[model samples]
Each structure stands twice: as structure tokens, then as C-alpha cells.
Target: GSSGSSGISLKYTAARLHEKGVLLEIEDLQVNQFKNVIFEISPTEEVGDFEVKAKFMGVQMETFMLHYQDLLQLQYEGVAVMKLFDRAKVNVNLLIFLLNKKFYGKSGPSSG
Candidate 1:
């Protein structure tokens, strides 16, 4: 099923914790395909330590804590995991957009 058909859309927010560090959060994740999503990276700061708050449709969702050392790998691993299924097209796009936004800062894609 397509997100547009289901009348659901996924949104993400990324915030810089400091120089070379970012917090990526996904929202409106009511879609079932994303339920088991996992991020296999150690956070430089604990979930509660960062100032940024993440949510999925108004409810708190786990956030990916990334540093310069972890950026590329995060994108790689995220895309690798999403590759296991065909329904993850939106998921992969969002992941890459967030990664690039964090990496390139204001120069990243303005819209996706």
C-alpha cells in the first residue's frame, strides 16, 4: 500500500546537538512497515541528555544520535536494513535525506 493511498505521511526532524553532532527523529510513523526499525549506533549522548525531543505523530519516538564518525555508516546501515523489503522506499528516502542534511548542513536538499 502506498503512503499517499493510506493518507499517511512520514516526517522527520534533525537538530544539531553541537558541532559535528546531530539528532535525527522520525514522525508520523504509524505505518506498520517501520515498526521493527532499529538503529545500531551508540549515542554520544544518552537519549535524555540531548535538548532535542523526538516524536511520532505527537508521541515520543527513539532518536538516532549521530556524530561525524557515525554519519556515513548510519546511512549505510539504515539503507541496508531497509533494502530487505520493497515497501521501505519512503523509509530509505527519509533516512538518506536526514543523513545528508546532517552532513551537508544547510546545503542539503531543501525538500524531498
Candidate 2:
């Protein structure tokens, strides 16, 4: 049985925690021949501790007890992650935009 459909879209949110390091809203989200981007947000000047709220596919979460190193990675090695800092609000908002045309505005399983 062959179908004309493209692929499946799995959404996820990852929050940086001080105690746990990284907390995923969804475990091992699937990308399936598509792009699964990641984003992060933390205080740039290291101000004690903070919280980050993330939402993916309508699922929302909040992570507390953030560390300084977590922000460091987003600043240096993780450049893309740092973009979330540009915005005043912690809402990364569309952290990952799919490049595949087929995935865009699909009415079936995945609709963002």
C-alpha cells in the first residue's frame, strides 16, 4: 500500500534546569526526515537562578533552578539557542521552522 503523504511531525520542548541540566517536555520526539530545531533562554549576566517556559505542539512546561553554565552553552557553542535571548519575552516562538514544503501548512496529522 503506497500513499502520497509526506511524513510525520513530532513537536517537543526542552528546558534548561540547574539541578537536572535539561528537561524535555516530550521524550525522544521524532523528526522523520524533517528538521527538529532546538532553542534555549537564560540570563546573560548570570543572575542567581531563573525559569524558562517552553511550549511545543500546544504542550507547555516550565523549568526552574537554572544554572550559569546552561546560559554559557547557549551563548557560545549553541548560537542558535541564543537567538531566544534577543526577544525580551522568554517566548522563543517558532524556534524551529520546517524547511520542507510538504510539511508546511499540512492539514492532516501535523498543523502548526
Candidate 3:
């Protein structure tokens, strides 16, 4: 039997900053539920346009951008898929931690 929670695995996906913006990509994504998702980055002083997007099972979901100044929201099959924190950060290690907490309900520093 698996030692961890079923349908849950934590992995860090690498990201890079490009001329356009920070680029991140994930392949073979599998998850049960995602909620209260928060992404934080250090040196938060840097000011620029922030955004995020995801595609699941070949379907394109809503795109999140800082311009909205609200929770980055998305839905699928008439159900809300995930809610993103408008205020967020970087450091992949922190990202992984946040993800683990979101899915497993573990206690830790707030990712939002």
C-alpha cells in the first residue's frame, strides 16, 4: 500500500522568467481537488503584470491575471475547479509546500 494519501503526489515543477513573463508548465497532472490556492514570491516589491492559466483533460480553463484584483477563479462541468489567491509569490520549494497543504490539509505558513 502507498504510504501517502491516495490520489496525492507532491512534485516541484521548474519555472523560468521570460521576456513576456514567468513561464511554468506541468505535464501529466493528476489531482482530486484544489482549493484556497496561494502562490507567494519574495522581493514582492517588484511590480509587473501577473497572470496564470491551466488546461485540464484537453479543456482550456479560465486565465487569471492581476488586473482583476480578485480571486483567480475557474470552473469545469458546472463545478468550480480551483480558486487562486490574488496575492501570491515564488520559490519553487514554497510552491510545493503550498500545494501539499492545499490538497492534504496540512498546516503551515499561509501560501496566500
Best by TM-score: 1
TM-score each candidate: 0.24, 0.22, 0.20
Question: For model 3, what is the alpha-carbon lDDT of residue 63?
Answer: 44
True-structure lDDT of candidate 3? 0.30
In candidate 1, where is summed lDDT lowest over 10 consecutive residues?
43-52
lDDT per residue (tens digit) for residues 4-86 in model 3: 64432232222322111322222222221222222222111223333344323332343444321222222123322222332
Sort by TM-score, best first: 1, 2, 3
lDDT of 1 at 5: 35
Off by over 4 Å in 2: 1-26, 31-34, 42-46, 57-63, 68-112
Candidate 1 lands at a TM-score of: 0.24
User: Tens digit of lDDT per residue, candidate 1, span 1-112?
Assistant: 3354321223332222211222223343333424434323222322222122234244345543334444346566664333212222223435445544433333234577
Ranking by lDDT: 1, 2, 3
**lDDT tens digits, residue span 43-106, model 2:** 2222334433343343345443444455555545544433332432221112222212212242
The residue ranges of model 1 lying beyond 4 angstroms of the native Cα positions read: 1-52, 56-64, 74-79, 82-94, 101-103, 106-112
The Cα local distance difference test for each model comes to 0.34, 0.33, 0.30
lDDT winner between 1 and 3, please give it: 1
**Measured by C-alpha RMSD in angstroms, how accurate is candidate 2?**
15.7
